[PDB]
Symmetry: C4
Subunit: 165 residues, 4 copies
Amino acid sequence: MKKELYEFYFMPPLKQIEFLEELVNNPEKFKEFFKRLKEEPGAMELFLRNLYLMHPMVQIYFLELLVENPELFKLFFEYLEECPGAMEQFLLNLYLLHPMVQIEFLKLLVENPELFRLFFEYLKRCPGALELFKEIIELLDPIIQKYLKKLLEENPELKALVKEV
Amino acid sequence: MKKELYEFYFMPPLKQIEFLEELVNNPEKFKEFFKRLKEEPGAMELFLRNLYLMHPMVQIYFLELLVENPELFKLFFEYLEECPGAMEQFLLNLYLLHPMVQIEFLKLLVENPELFRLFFEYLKRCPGALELFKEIIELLDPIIQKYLKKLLEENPELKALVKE
Amino acid sequence: MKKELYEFYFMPPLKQIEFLEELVNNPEKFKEFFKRLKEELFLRNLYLMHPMVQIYFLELLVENPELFKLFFEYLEECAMEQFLLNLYLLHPMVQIEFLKLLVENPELFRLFFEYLKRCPGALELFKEIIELLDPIIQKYLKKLLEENPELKALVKE
Amino acid sequence: MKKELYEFYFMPPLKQIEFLEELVNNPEKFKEFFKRLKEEPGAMELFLRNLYLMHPMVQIYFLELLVENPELFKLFFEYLEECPGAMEQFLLNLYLLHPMVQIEFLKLLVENPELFRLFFEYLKRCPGALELFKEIIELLDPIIQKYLKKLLEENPELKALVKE
């Protein structure tokens, strides 16, 4: 994926929405596109950057599809986990996300504790970045910290999974 | 319902305003739209979040149309009360709304005080909700507070009804 | 009148600039059409428009000086508080340029203060806006006040 | 030229990228683009503001083009060196840049440390500027400062280059 990443970024949002749906609806091309970005040096950082510089609803739609297909949230995170720098960009974007996009990613993680448990597990799997996701959550707008605290308090083990160390 | 709402979001804002004006000017389509959202899982919250992520002027014009047609502002917020978590979603948007949109929304509410009281009445009906709004009042830039002060000093009873 | 202001907003930005450019170039269009508004929503729509549209509309007032007076003439007639508030809520680049245009055209700067000095307004209102600012903007504002040593004394007065 | 600069801004964002991609390759147009801006009084400040208000990808891709062609990253900065304030406008933009664009600019400097030192040598040349960039970096978002420190662990040399 040397090029296309910019071309696909400048594809119309309705085509980006449709492309991401077909990519998620069938694991075909899903594995290819993320493997091409995985094998290419740093191209996984660009995709996340492109994905997280895209229109906000394109990012929300991808998160909703990853929840609807939990197996692909595994494969999407499995590629992000191995390649270097891809885990840091995902975290960096979390703070730089629009708070409505933040609350939707936090709402989907709470409703999917298995994906939430997968999300935190991969954070421990990546060298470091434990402090990063910590500081990103601590250094955030207060109502997000309030809302996240209330959602985690509904399931204390999910709260205990946030407490960690 | 995803096709109904998500396409409505991605459609051009001027076409959305055309639909919003058609939905408002016809009160029964307004009733139908929000009654259709109640049975569907979180369709109100989805439609709200879509409305919250839309263009600011569309949100503003939607607020104006609800002011010019008062009964629908009642229906919109009474449907919000019926839908669990909708008022929580609305107050969260007000905190995350662009400060200019917050001022226009506040000015329209103070100008039509019955809509301002009806705004609070449904917030208290929900499990919690009202407590969130009081914390949202704290976290805002000063020009919101100062411009709130100019209007609310001319009618301190509204500022009184806020603390009540 | 609502459609005119909303249609002018939702038009493509390049056409909005071309709409304002000839409207400002022809003095009758800037003088009479703005008088039809007299017969806040336009300011908000302008200040919710694309930054380039806001930048060029402010620059067009510099390119044609007499119409910047008229622009502030009608606003001062009835609205001033809305213009002062929109300044604080303006995008930082839009704000810097507006203050930079006043220093580039000092007669518009004095005219900006003069219309604000009408009634005991902006004596404290425009005072707060300067103090409630991020530091890096103030540095550029202060360094630009050095060019034109004359303007330094007028701001303190 | 003011029509030409505004035509470049309001050109479609994909068009702006294709124009900048070609302009970098051939120096003849590249030198013409900044020579015609420098012969005008203060037009370099205008084009910068235009570039600094363009789409984030347009701003990012222009920096990447200068990174892919390191000699022209010196030239584009050499042309800004001629007039004062354009450096300050470049620094003012860096603070006012979207946080992902500030990271992208710093990340390109980390991936090409020689261009980092190239850009940093220019800052000490302008009056202040090095003092202003000192203020900018210490007044950024915390995670932007945090991730910068992690980039200092990847390149501790840059810490010594900063001390100068």
